[PDB]
Amino acid sequence: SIDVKYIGVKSAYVSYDVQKRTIYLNITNTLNITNNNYYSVEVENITAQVQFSKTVIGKARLNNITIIGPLDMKQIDYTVPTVIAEEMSYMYDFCTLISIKVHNIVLMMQVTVTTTYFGHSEQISQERYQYVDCG
Amino acid sequence: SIDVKYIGVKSAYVSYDVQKRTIYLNITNTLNITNNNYYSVEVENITAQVQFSKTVIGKARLNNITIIGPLDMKQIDYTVPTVIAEEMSYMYDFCTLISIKVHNIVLMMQVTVTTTYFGHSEQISQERYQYVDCG
Amino acid sequence: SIDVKYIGVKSAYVSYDVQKRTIYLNITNTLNITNNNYYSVEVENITAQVQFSKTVIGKARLNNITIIGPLDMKQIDYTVPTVIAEEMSYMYDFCTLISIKVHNIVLMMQVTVTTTYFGHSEQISQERYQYVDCG
């Protein structure tokens, strides 16, 4: 919630990059850094009263106070019918990264059907570092 | 929730990178760093009262106070029918990374049907570092 | 929840990288680092009262206070029918990493049907470092 970085190659505080047929003669670097980070996040002071019927007196009657009625979820549901008579396939693959007809599914339900949650909830996902290298 | 970084290659505080036919003569580096991190996160002070019927007196009657009625979930449900008469396949694969018709499913349910959760909940996933190297 | 890093190759505090036909003559590095990390996370002070009927007196009657009625889950349920008359397959694979028709399923349920959870819950998953190297 403060530093959410997606970086491509490299991350650094102080970085020197000297490449590709270069000459670097008798230099004098002198850093005097003072880098202090005082985070104080999420400091909460909660005081909650949560009733559904507080202090009912005197020959009363309640009915169907909280009804989360008929509930239906069908999150990922997909149909891929394939009707073929004659299929001919040729793959000549070299130094490649092929994915044919794969199904990559990720599902993360943090706080599903519930009542009266306090505190903190966090979901983090990061996946599939795939890579191919040929000389 | 503070430093959620997805980095491609390298991560460093102080980094020097000297490559590819370079000359680096009699230099004088002198760092004087002071890097202090005082995190104080998630400091919570909760005080909760959660009743469903507090202090009912006097010949009263309650009914169906909290009813989370008929509940249905069908999270991942997918049909891949394939009707073929004649299929001919040829794969000539070299130095490659092939995935054919795979099914990669990840499912993480932190706090499902419940009541009165306190505290903290955290879900983290990161997967499939795949890699192919040929000379 | 603070440092959730997905790094590609390398991670370091102070890093030197000198490669690929380079010359590095009579240098003088001098670091004076002071790196202190004082984490104080998740410091909680909870005080909860959770009743479903507190202090009912006097010829009262309660009924169906908390009813989490008919509940159904069908998390991962998928059908892959395959009807073939004549299938001919040829695979000539070299230095490769093949996965054909695999099923990789991961399921993690932290706090399922419950009541009155306190404290902390954490789920972490990270898998499938696959790798192929040919000279």
Side-chain angles (χ1 to χ4, degrees):
Chain A
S1 172
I2 284 177
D3 276 359
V4 193
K5 301 181 189 295
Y6 193 115
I7 309 189
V9 179
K10 65 167 67 66
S11 172
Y13 196 91
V14 177
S15 176
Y16 292 67
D17 202 271
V18 190
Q19 310 165 332
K20 312 206 181 188
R21 304 185 179 169
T22 173
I23 292 186
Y24 202 96
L25 291 207
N26 67 316
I27 86 158
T28 305
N29 300 332
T30 302
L31 284 79
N32 179 6
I33 310 186
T34 300
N35 172 32
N36 301 118
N37 318 128
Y38 315 75
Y39 313 158
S40 158
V41 313
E42 293 276 349
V43 169
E44 305 185 22
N45 185 335
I46 302 184
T47 303
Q49 308 189 14
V50 184
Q51 298 88 16
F52 276 20
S53 162
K54 173 176 185 175
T55 321
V56 50
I57 84 168
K59 313 180 189 177
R61 46 174 67 196
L62 307 184
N63 179 23
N64 287 12
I65 285 294
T66 301
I67 164 172
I68 300 189
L71 201 154
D72 186 319
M73 303 195 197
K74 206 164 314 179
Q75 303 263 333
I76 294 157
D77 167 18
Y78 59 84
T79 309
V80 193
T82 300
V83 189
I84 316 173
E86 174 171 346
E87 201 172 39
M88 188 179 82
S89 311
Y90 279 86
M91 279 76 80
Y92 303 74
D93 300 0
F94 194 105
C95 282
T96 178
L97 193 153
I98 310 290
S99 304
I100 297 186
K101 301 174 181 167
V102 307
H103 299 55
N104 309 137
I105 294 90
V106 177
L107 203 155
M108 312 168 60
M109 315 162 57
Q110 179 84 262
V111 180
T112 317
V113 193
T114 178
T115 307
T116 311
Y117 178 104
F118 303 82
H120 160 99
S121 282
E122 153 178 335
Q123 267 181 341
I124 302 185
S125 177
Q126 49 201 4
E127 62 197 62
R128 263 182 295 281
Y129 185 110
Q130 295 157 335
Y131 181 101
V132 168
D133 197 326
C134 278
Chain B
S1 172
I2 284 177
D3 276 359
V4 193
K5 301 181 189 295
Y6 193 115
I7 309 189
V9 178
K10 65 167 67 66
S11 172
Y13 196 91
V14 177
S15 176
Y16 292 67
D17 202 271
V18 190
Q19 310 165 332
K20 312 206 181 188
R21 304 185 179 169
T22 173
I23 292 186
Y24 202 96
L25 291 207
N26 67 316
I27 86 158
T28 305
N29 300 332
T30 302
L31 284 79
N32 179 6
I33 310 186
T34 300
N35 172 32
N36 301 118
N37 319 128
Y38 315 75
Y39 313 158
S40 158
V41 313
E42 293 276 349
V43 169
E44 305 185 22
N45 185 336
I46 302 184
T47 303
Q49 308 189 14
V50 184
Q51 298 88 16
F52 276 20
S53 162
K54 173 176 185 175
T55 321
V56 50
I57 84 168
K59 313 180 189 177
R61 46 174 67 196
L62 307 184
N63 179 23
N64 287 12
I65 285 294
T66 301
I67 164 172
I68 300 189
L71 201 154
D72 186 319
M73 303 195 197
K74 206 164 314 179
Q75 303 263 333
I76 294 157
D77 167 18
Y78 59 84
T79 309
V80 193
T82 300
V83 189
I84 316 173
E86 174 171 346
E87 201 172 39
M88 188 179 82
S89 311
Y90 279 86
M91 279 76 80
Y92 303 74
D93 300 0
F94 194 105
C95 282
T96 178
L97 193 153
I98 310 290
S99 304
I100 297 186
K101 301 174 181 167
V102 307
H103 299 55
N104 309 137
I105 294 90
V106 177
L107 203 155
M108 312 168 60
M109 315 162 57
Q110 179 84 262
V111 180
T112 317
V113 193
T114 178
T115 307
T116 311
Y117 178 104
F118 303 82
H120 160 99
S121 282
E122 152 178 335
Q123 267 181 341
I124 302 185
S125 177
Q126 49 201 4
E127 62 197 62
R128 263 182 295 281
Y129 185 110
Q130 295 157 335
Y131 181 101
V132 168
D133 197 326
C134 278
Chain C
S1 172
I2 284 177
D3 276 359
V4 193
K5 301 181 189 295
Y6 193 115
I7 309 189
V9 178
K10 65 168 67 66
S11 172
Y13 196 91
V14 177
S15 176
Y16 292 67
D17 202 271
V18 190
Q19 310 165 332
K20 312 206 181 188
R21 304 185 179 169
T22 173
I23 292 186
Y24 202 96
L25 291 207
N26 67 316
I27 86 158
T28 305
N29 300 332
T30 302
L31 284 79
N32 179 6
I33 310 186
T34 300
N35 172 32
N36 301 118
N37 319 128
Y38 315 75
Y39 313 158
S40 158
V41 313
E42 293 276 349
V43 169
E44 305 185 22
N45 185 335
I46 302 184
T47 303
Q49 308 189 14
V50 184
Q51 298 88 16
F52 276 20
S53 162
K54 174 176 185 175
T55 321
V56 50
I57 84 168
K59 313 180 189 177
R61 46 174 67 196
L62 307 184
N63 179 23
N64 287 12
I65 285 294
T66 301
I67 164 172
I68 300 189
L71 201 154
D72 186 319
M73 303 195 197
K74 206 164 314 179
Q75 303 263 333
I76 294 157
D77 167 18
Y78 59 84
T79 309
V80 193
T82 300
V83 189
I84 316 173
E86 174 171 345
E87 201 172 39
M88 188 179 82
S89 311
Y90 279 86
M91 279 76 80
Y92 302 74
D93 300 0
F94 194 105
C95 282
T96 178
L97 193 153
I98 310 290
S99 303
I100 297 186
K101 301 174 181 167
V102 307
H103 300 55
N104 309 137
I105 294 90
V106 177
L107 203 155
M108 312 168 60
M109 315 162 57
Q110 179 84 262
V111 180
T112 317
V113 193
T114 178
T115 307
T116 311
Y117 178 104
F118 303 82
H120 160 99
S121 282
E122 153 178 335
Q123 267 181 341
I124 302 185
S125 177
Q126 49 201 4
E127 62 197 62
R128 263 182 295 281
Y129 185 110
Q130 295 157 335
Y131 181 101
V132 168
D133 197 326
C134 278

